[PDB]
Design a protein around this ligand. Structure first.
Ligand SMILES: OC[C@H]1O[C@H](O[C@@H]2[C@@H](OC[C@H]3O[C@@H](O)[C@@H](O)[C@@H](O[C@H]4O[C@H](CO)[C@@H](O)[C@H](O)[C@@H]4O[C@H]4O[C@H](CO)[C@@H](O)[C@H](O)[C@@H]4O)[C@@H]3O)O[C@H](CO)[C@@H](O)[C@@H]2O)[C@@H](O)[C@@H](O)[C@@H]1O
Ligand SMILES: OC[C@H]1O[C@H](O[C@@H]2[C@@H](OC[C@H]3O[C@@H](O)[C@@H](O)[C@@H](O[C@H]4O[C@H](CO)[C@@H](O)[C@H](O)[C@@H]4O[C@H]4O[C@H](CO)[C@@H](O)[C@H](O)[C@@H]4O)[C@@H]3O)O[C@H](CO)[C@@H](O)[C@@H]2O)[C@@H](O)[C@@H](O)[C@@H]1O
Lengths: 212, 219, 213, 225
């Protein structure tokens, strides 16, 4: 197996900058390398093949170069449409391997998340289900960690998270974690809390409420 | 000691799709015409599809033509049945059967069957969402939770589009029940919690469902 | 298109009897006919092909005959293992068609079902679901009809039935019909009723209850 | 332009199976090597499988090898991916991609992609049942016979075995075949008829055993208040 490694994993920059993404192969792959662009919820688009050849339709601000084990993709003059994930691929006749992808996001100053907790509504509660929501509003960077504590007991396997894309106005992210429980299991405990760890915080911030 | 085995059955919503595979043991499928048959809950058998050698002829029951497709893979001994635009009467136990005998003639019976795989088609093709308030407990946060709908998408506005600043509508999550859930939140000034009214408008076009729900800080 | 019709739809007999199942074709198919045995939850087994040829391994008590548009499958000396469903099939080169199937059951006297109705338990009710169960106990023959009425309104599409096989002791059947509703929908109505129609009854039996009492 | 479309994605339990199809438009697959790629939730792409022209070479990633199978149908332009013994790390968006270019060489990139289909593998392979009583009602008793039982609902997978009074009660017991509900969980009910006079002395407990989750629940059924 040939192993492809991209660098960096996340590249923060501003519109108009010139950025470079590196792709390293564990072995020599000559010029059998391609670069793909992918946006959330869409299919990957082939940008470059044979290390340097631009596919018909790709803007000239994209370029690719390199050989052997070192390859680079350069975006000269980042436009708003260029913010996406970029994958390098070693494609063989009957197999292929990808890198981890490089997410190119809009660079901004670190912002702490505004944390809120929402208990389940009584209308939903009487139906038999309790959804406890925890919201992280306008933070940066994207990496955050949310843990649920019910009577000091750490929850696992009963919550789902959902993250927005970069806001066009403030270039921040927002996250929502939903802890779903049955009415009985919800009625069996008292204090519900979400503890949030993020680079913009000096320590994990805990938002809680007492059932009642 | 010839053997066949199906895979891929399960639960499907009305109008959905489902693909079944069929593997064999102690013989090769290349020489045999392969068939898909289904046992309906009524108890009787119903011929679904047939594919000849070299895929020269592909035949379907009248009830499934234009919706089903049969394929074969002789080099690895596999048979496939795609079922699209599935109806409720497609609910059945699907068996994969072989046409053959001790000598291969031009028309032999089904001498080998697989155990079958269960395919259940629920009648509900769409479901409308339930909308619950996320009440505001400086700056306050409020919203509404749009839970248990199928399929995507769901659009959410605030105050018929008047309120746009500070609104975050999160991507839908697929719950373990098979239904989608999302939440839409807004940041507001605290002082506006007593005067300004907050209504989230949830539209689910697949079910033509429209729900306008207002959110209070609770008593 | 050729349509295959089996007769009867249900054939009741006793162990040791000699039974005949008829298969009729709308058009002449000569001897392009097969007979299959199938038991519940199992795969169909090929018994006879080309109208009369018995497959190697099939007991000699099975036999088939006929041609053109008339075919018969005879089991001479029914054993307990022979109670199953039997399908006749016209098989063409690239298509096939089956009959409706003939279920061979143990013959018994007609028995009326003892009907019972169970409201949803409070434990289930406060969790958000109300299951109302209707039970038809020990009846014969298998054909029964169960209709749900909620506040005199006939329900359709919100109930599921489940039938047992012939009981090894009395050769009867039992059926359970479950009407499932949300807690709100259950709290929205008062009277729930199961109406049962069966030949062993002179008239439909209705078991009902008022939500609360 | 050329287009591809996947079908067959959805929810799967750990250890289950699922087959995906891929149809095309405005080109033929016969000349093209076809591939399956998946985007994991982490964000990166992962090559899953490849099938050559005429199905001569079939290659798989190590993480799916021995469990996945790729097939092609050139005469009707379809591609298939069987996924067996599915693991939770198989959760991804699966795209069916074409190997090709403006002119067909011996090694071209993936120039055409489908929109992808979501395949989610839940970690829970089994679920224990909820058992509720079907109590002998004040009015639902005719003659000298009463009926009681318990409803074993929302479990996965089959089977569930039900005894009464640790096996003491066998006469008159009917355990009905399981029903598959629209939620994907199974539901069953077990009933027994008993003499009415025995309602005061003899206690009635149904023992429900679901070995796939090894869950055992003994529930007693009394008349309501
Ligand atoms: O299909 C139901 C039965 O299937 C199994 O038995 C097979 C069956 O094959 C039927 C036979 O029908 C003929 O008309 C041809 O279509 C034949 O395939 C010919 O054509 C393809 C291209 O279409 C060629 O690649 C083949 O090589 C073959 O061509 C040769 O054979 C022709 C027929 O002799 C001849 O005209 C031609 O010139 C070539 O010489 C197709 O296979 O019957 C076969 C014979 O009984 C049997 O070997 C097959 O396996 C089996 O399941 C049966 O029980 C089913 O009833
Ligand atoms: O597969 C990866 C590339 O796929 C696309 O390009 C195709 C590729 O085909 C590879 C070529 O490899 C050879 O070894 C053969 O396997 C050939 O197929 C032969 O064998 C089958 C039976 O297995 C026959 O039916 C075929 O007719 C063919 O036999 C003839 O052709 C042979 C090669 O010329 C010859 O040796 C033989 O004697 C016969 O005359 C298989 O097709 O490369 C082709 C040439 O570059 C191209 O046309 C194919 O479309 C494409 O997506 C690429 O990007 C992939 O890298």
């Amino acid at each position: 197996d040939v192993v492809m490694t991209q660098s960096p994993s996340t590249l923060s920059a501003s519109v108009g900058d010139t950025i470079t993404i590196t792709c390293r192969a564990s072995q020599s792959i000559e010029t059998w390398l391609a670069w793909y662009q992918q946006k959330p919820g869409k299919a990957p688009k082939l940008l470059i093949y044979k290390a340097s050849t631009l596919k018909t339709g790709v803007p000239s601000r994209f370029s690719g170069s390199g050989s052997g084990t070192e390859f680079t993709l350069t975006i000269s003059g980042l436009q708003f449409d260029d913010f996406a994930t970029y994958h390098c691929q070693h494609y063989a006749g009957y197999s292929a391997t990808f890198g981890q992808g490089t997410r190119v996001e809009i660079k901004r100053t670190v912002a702490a998340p505004s944390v809120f907790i929402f208990p389940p509504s009584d209308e939903q509660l009487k139906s038999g289900t309790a959804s406890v929501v925890c919201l992280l509003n306008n933070f940066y960077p994207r990496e955050a960690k949310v843990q649920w504590k019910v009577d000091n007991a750490l929850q696992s396997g009963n919550s789902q998270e959902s993250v927005t894309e970069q806001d066009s106005k403030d270039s921040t992210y927002s996250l929502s974690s939903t802890l779903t429980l049955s009415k009985a299991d919800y009625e069996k405990h008292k204090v519900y809390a979400c503890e949030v760890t993020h680079q913009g915080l000096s320590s994990p911030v805990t938002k809680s409420f007492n059932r009642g | 000691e010839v053997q066949l085995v199906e895979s891929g059955g399960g639960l499907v919503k009305a109008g959905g799709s489902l693909i079944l595979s069929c593997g064999v043991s102690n013989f090769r499928i290349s020489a045999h015409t392969m068939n898909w048959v289904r046992r309906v809950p009524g108890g009787g058998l119903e011929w679904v599809a047939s594919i000849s050698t070299s895929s020269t002829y592909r035949d379907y029951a009248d009830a499934v033509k234009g919706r089903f497709t049969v394929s074969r893979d002789d080099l690895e001994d596999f048979v496939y049945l795609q079922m699209h635009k599935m109806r409720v009467e497609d609910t059945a136990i699907y068996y994969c059967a072989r046409k053959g005998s001790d000598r291969l003639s031009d028309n032999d019976p089904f001498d080998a069957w697989g155990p079958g795989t269960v395919v259940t088609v629920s009648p509900a093709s769409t479901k409308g969402p339930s909308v619950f308030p996320l009440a505001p407990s400086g700056t306050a946060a409020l919203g509404c939770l749009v839970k248990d709908y199928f399929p995507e998408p769901v659009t959410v506005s605030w105050n018929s589009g008047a309120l746009t600043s500070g609104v975050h509508t999160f991507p839908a999550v697929l719950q373990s029940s098979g239904l989608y859930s999302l939440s839409s939140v807004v940041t507001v000034p605290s002082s506006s919690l007593g005067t300004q009214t907050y209504i989230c408008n949830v539209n689910h076009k697949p079910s033509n469902t429209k729900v306008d729900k207002k959110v209070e800080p609770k008593s």
